[PDB]
């Protein structure tokens, strides 16, 4: 990164170690969530990676940055499967006309359960991958799946954990 | 196996007539120019080194790698070993080195080393050099006493267009005069190339001295002075017409596959014709031993040198004598070697520990295909030589006898060197053309282990006897103002 | 710009590197290979860096005497054991990193774990031979007895790193060197030498389990773990001057130019390795197939054209990184009226990184680059020390297919981020040895990082 | 050499001299350059005493 | 980017069209106009003007060549590039000939003197440098092409010489 | 990764003349092996500024030269 | 059927000269054709008076 800035490490552990809690903490489920704070996290990330490269096998900052890193990456791939679910459901709720009465009801969705069956196998490499962020898998994914469950009658392992 | 040659079985690969436009479709991708270009970010450049970041690698194919051999149906030898590595290591070797050269022909093999990679029929010097460098190869040429190498290092993608380049050398190269002209500067480089290396330098005089002005004698460097005289175009072509042809020509590859190694050999031959193999003098060597006092008036060290001719490497006498360098080893007191580097070797315990005042002693042996040069290299103070020769003479009087613990430790020391040598690539490729030129044949690591368990304290006193009886080949280097004279050796071998 | 993929099929036709950590804390990794001989050795992170000032050069001694002699065996017994398995027991002590590994036939590789475990272990540091060892210590500490090269790799660190311990020599100065007793080496066995700092690596013919179940057994006593490494700041690189003029000492005058680097796990570290690629190396008595006049090397080229005679006997460039820092930068040995012209163009050359790098010179770089690390994994000892290495600098061994993967990224535009956020109009270090009246003061030459052109 | 250009482009109206030879295109071959005849002991052409009579 | 937009229309546009044949080995047919232009205006173009003025400029060009007893490729001037690199290679035979009869026409030129005529009886449009000027154009094309496809940059104005491409020393005014 | 070699590759035969891999010693650490792992007598890491080429530098050895001057002829104003 | 390396020599620029190159090109013995004037036409006669003065 181009800057003249220096930090001591306790400046950078305190920084790494405030973004970290800001980004796990935040609810990913609200897109707008996203949408107005990853901007803010991008722009300090970048800043933490700098400052923090000298210490990525500190026996206290290596963890944090290694812990940041896979938050970030959890929460990329969160939001881009929430994504599309969301654009499931809005096309679903066009289908349903003015009023929900069809009085100018859209085209609905003709692949639905292909639909599911492919968001379903997302959301359960999510869980492989990021084993310990189910937390927030469940929060934002498998919410999200559970919505849909209420459109279309589909099978889904922790489907009966969300009372379907 | 199609194909027997000189003891060897090939497997004949044929000739094909293939358009030009298809083979071009098989020609490894890569570019010269880059005109415009797609612009993409680096996508790790926020990944960390210790973060995996491929994933979904192909499992791997491993297996054992076995050294093949093929030949074309112009008589070129195609040996091929792939390790599963991803350099490729091609060499080029021709029976034809300083030991064919006539008295009038002084050098010439030297000059075919110089002329290497210049201009050829379907290429330029400098878009052959260009071609080299852009790709990331490296190599040269080597002129040596009994063959000629031409190699290059690469990686294994490029291969199609390093074993063009590489055969280009002898198939079609214009030897034009002002190409040639402008390699006489290589002659002034390689004689300081040569004279830096003591060690080379020192060998270097040993064969002269001990095989006077014949086969293995003959200078391995061109002079700088009358011999530019044929330092020309067509004398260098008229040399290679007598010498260099298909069937005096092995091609090695090491790393590379071996069907597609032989298909893209194949593919330059198949509409060219190679020099035609031509009968030539072939006279074995003659052994006169003798002496040199060459002074160095820079070196206040004296290198002494006393050599015995072996029958070579095609003899019954070439394990033995192996095990007897080791068994003799050696070392230097430069180096501090620890545990398993000859630290107990008999030289070593016998001079090294002994006698404060004796630089490096080393047992030296060389072997061409009909003969070679045994001996032990000893070096010291200008003023100490005359204690010097008397230490190696009375080593060399100490070779009646060895002990059995003597005789296991150099068998083992000797499987241990084979071995260790062996995995080195460039080492290999080296070792299987030289086989080749000499015998014929190729004696693979292991075989010569089981040769090296079989040598027994009889075979090593019977060697070096026969050894000890021929006369002494005596070089001094460096400060040679107190040297004893060779008839001082000659008699103190005389007892022998 | 993207040119596409150079990652074959080939490059992941190799045998997997498998790592364990045994439950003492030490990793085990070892390599399949189908060879007749093999390397097995101990990578410990341990160096002159971990030494504090009054007994720095106690590691490198340790290292010398290790050999020597153990409790249960003696130097002559050991020697002879190791040339009756036909075998070679080696060893190194660098700043941050030390190896004791032994080159053995297939036959030799259990017997030999035994060896370097009870060298390791039970050292008998006898007396005689640390005198001994003094004396040929004390020699090689004299500056007559070492290279230019050698002195300049030492000052270069002495300059750049004053305030932290990797300005620290491994062999030490001559006052401990002089003190040195078998009581710091035990101390620094005990200390440095556990369990979760060494990889116990084998490359050849070797079957994993079998190589777990030895190392278990014979590094059972090992002291498992030692306390955490002080927290330090990231080491302050000093932009300093350190010349050593000497008119008596011949014509050739060698001179090591510094920036500051990148760790091992920084993401640029490739791009720096690129860079040191580009930059490259040239000498006047071993050109090559193309002469200097005609290198793509743009540096080559243009210096072998200074004067009609060329300014550069020789040059390279060298990438050194550690935990936490690194250096860049290249070292030249040139004619005394040339060293002008040669540290000029050395600088202009790693300036044009930040403007003007074209996207051919970075594909030659790449290919060679490509060329010098995989072939320098062909033999059994180029495989351990790159799994020890890499064990030690990433905690992970990166494969010939994730190199070229992350390789194919970078272009002349990641070239030049990389250059212009780290390397242009930096801090730079000069070090020197001989005739140097043409070197210039270090901000003339610390104003040649940047251009007034574009 | 001092600055200098020459003009080695791919024109876009005149051919190169490959395609189109502007000498007369008849040269005799040897196989050495020794076998060329010399000028100097080749006979030339009769002499002429009227400028219209030059060939 | 606009640049980078450019850089890749770029690479695209000379992507399509690697290999092309050059116009002027492509078997042409003159359009149905330029071949009405050639019956009629070339033959007469020909015949009254063309034709005249270029015999007579040619004969004239033979006469002075035969005055100075000198022929047309000697006088190609050295100061050309192709021609320095020419005659570095010419054999020796064919260069002490060059030599003794240009020496010869400049003696007779200065003198204002002309070439006996009995020694005039001889063709001077023999093209004996085509060898040679063929083979140093293809070693200046490898170089072009192979060393010379960018602007270089190069430390400006060091060691005599400008840096901007000329090889040799103080052969500019500003490096005197 | 580390690179274990040096930027200028040898290019050269790794064994010496008329020696084999049978009898040229152990190329690891003998001392007339092309390939020897150096000494470290001063420590691990120098190899990185090592001139690896055996022949000794000769300062000031023209290079430059495009065949404008005949050796021992000094150039005056470059020509 | 010829060894490629015996083609490519005959292909040597030098192998190539015009038709009549022997019988055409001028080999000029001196510079001052006959009849035409030199030293041995302007020198003064031996007996002449010194121009030096003059
Ligand atoms: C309301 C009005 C508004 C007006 C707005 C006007 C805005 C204008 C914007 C202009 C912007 C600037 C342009 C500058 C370009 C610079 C290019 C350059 O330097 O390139 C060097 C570059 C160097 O290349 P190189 O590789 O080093 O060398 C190439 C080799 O030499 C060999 O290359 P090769 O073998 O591949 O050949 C390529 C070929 C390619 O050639 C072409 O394509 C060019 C063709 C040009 C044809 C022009 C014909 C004009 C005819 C007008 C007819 C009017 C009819 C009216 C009918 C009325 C009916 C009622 O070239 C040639 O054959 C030779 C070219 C010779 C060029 C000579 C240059 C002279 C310039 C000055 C001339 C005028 C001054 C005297 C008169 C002034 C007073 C009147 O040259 C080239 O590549 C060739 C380019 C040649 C360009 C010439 C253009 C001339 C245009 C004249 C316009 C006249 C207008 C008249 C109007 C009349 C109306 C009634
Ligand atoms: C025929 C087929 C069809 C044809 C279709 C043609 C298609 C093209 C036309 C359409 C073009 C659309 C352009 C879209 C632009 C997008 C804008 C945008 O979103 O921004 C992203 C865009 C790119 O962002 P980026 O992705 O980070 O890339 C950065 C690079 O700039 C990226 O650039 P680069 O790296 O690629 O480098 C090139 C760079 C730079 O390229 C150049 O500058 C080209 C230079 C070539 C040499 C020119 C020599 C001079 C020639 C003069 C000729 C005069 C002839 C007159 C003839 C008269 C008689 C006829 O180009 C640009 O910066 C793009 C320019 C965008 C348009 C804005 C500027 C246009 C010129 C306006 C001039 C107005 C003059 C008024 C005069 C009034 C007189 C009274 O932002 C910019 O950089 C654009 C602005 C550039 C600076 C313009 C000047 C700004 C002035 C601000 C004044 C503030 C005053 C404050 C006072 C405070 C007092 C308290
Ligand atoms: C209605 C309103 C309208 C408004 C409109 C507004 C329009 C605004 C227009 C703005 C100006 C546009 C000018 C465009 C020109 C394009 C020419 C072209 O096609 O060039 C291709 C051409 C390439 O030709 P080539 O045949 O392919 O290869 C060339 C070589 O043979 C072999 O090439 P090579 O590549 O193999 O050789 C390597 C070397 C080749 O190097 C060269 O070619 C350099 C040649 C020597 C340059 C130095 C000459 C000596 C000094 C002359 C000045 C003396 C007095 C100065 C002080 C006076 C104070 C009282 O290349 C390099 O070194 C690459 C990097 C070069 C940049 C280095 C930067 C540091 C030095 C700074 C000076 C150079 C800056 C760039 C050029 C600027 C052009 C204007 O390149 C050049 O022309 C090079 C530049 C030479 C001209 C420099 C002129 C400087 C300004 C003088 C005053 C002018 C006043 C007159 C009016 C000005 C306005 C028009
Ligand atoms: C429709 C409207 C049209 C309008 C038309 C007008 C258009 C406007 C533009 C006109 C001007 C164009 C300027 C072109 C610049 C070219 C730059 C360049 O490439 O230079 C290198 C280039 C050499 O090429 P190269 O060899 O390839 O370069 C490689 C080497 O590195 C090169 O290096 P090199 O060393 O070999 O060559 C360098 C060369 C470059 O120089 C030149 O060749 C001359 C360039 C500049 C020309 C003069 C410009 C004058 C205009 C500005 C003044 C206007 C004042 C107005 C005031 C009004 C007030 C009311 O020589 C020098 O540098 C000599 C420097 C000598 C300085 C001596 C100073 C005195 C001693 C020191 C100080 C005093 C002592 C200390 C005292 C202390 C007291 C205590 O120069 C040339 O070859 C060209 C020279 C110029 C030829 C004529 C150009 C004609 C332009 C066409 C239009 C003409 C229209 C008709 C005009 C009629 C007027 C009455
Ligand atoms: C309406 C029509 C408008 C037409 C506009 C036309 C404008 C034409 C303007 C021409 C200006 C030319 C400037 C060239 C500068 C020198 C060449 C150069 O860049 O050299 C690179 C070279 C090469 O640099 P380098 O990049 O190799 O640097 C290597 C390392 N260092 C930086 C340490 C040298 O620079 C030099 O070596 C020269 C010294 C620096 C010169 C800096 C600029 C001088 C500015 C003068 C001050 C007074 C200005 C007053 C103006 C007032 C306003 C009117
Ligand atoms: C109803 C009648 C309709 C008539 C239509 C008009 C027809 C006229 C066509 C001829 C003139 C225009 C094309 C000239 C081509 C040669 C120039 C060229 O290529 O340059 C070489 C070089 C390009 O070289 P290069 O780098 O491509 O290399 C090619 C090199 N050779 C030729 C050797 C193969 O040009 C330049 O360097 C840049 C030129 C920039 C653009 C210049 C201006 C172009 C014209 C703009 C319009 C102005 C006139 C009209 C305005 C209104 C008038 C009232
Ligand atoms: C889609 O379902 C819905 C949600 O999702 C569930 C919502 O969340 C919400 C909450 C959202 C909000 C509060 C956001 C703000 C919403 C607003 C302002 C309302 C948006 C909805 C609308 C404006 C309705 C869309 C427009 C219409 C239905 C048109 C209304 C006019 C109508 C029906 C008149 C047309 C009548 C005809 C064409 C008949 C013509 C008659 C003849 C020709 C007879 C002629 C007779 C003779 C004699 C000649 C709503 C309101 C919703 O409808």
Redesign the pocket.
Known sequence: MLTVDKFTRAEALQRASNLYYQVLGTNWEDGLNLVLDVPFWESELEKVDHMCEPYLCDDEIGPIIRNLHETVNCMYACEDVRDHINELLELSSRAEGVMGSGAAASEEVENMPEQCGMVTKAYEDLLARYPEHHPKIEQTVGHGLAVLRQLEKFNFKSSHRYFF | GKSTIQGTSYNVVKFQQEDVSEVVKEVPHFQFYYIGGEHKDNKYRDVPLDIPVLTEAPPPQLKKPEMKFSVLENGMRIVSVDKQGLTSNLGLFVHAGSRFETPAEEGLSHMVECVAFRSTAHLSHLRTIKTIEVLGMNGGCQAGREHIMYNLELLREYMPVASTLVVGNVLFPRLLPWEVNACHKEIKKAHERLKADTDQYVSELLHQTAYHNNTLGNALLANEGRALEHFTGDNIREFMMKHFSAERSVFVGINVDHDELCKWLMRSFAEYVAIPNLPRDEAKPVYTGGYKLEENADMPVCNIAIGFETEGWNSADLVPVTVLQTLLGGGGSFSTGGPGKGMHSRLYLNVLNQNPNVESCMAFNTQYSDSGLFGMYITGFGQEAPRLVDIALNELRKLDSFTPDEVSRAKNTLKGNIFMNAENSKVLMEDIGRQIIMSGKVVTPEEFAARVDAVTEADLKKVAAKLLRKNPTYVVYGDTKSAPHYEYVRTALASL | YYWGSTVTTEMHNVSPTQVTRLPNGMRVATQFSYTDSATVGLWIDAGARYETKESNGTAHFLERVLYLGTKNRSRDQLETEVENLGANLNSYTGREQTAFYAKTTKDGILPCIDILADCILNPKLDGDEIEKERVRITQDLQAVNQSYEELLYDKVHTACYRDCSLGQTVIGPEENVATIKRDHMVNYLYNNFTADRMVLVAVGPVDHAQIVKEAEKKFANIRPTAGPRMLEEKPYFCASELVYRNDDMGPTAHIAIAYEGVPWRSPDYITFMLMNAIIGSYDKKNEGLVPGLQSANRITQTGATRMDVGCFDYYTGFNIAYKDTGLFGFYIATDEVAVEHAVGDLMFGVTSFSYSLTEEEVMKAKRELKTNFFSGLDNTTGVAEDIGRQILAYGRRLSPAEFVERLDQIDSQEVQRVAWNRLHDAEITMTGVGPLHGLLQLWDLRRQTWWWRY | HRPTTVKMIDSWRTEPSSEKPMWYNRFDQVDHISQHPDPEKTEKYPPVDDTRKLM | ????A?ARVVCNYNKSIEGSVPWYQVKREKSPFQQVWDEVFTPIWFKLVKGPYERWEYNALVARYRGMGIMADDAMNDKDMIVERALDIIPEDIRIQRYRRMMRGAVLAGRKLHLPLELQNYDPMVPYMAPYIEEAKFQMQEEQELLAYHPWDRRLYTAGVSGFGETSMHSTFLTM | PPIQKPLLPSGRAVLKHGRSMLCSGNLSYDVNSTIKAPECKRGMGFTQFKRFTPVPIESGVSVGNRGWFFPGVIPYQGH | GEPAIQSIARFNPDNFRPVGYAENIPCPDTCVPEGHLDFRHTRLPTWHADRRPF
């Open positions: 980017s606009f640049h980078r450019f």
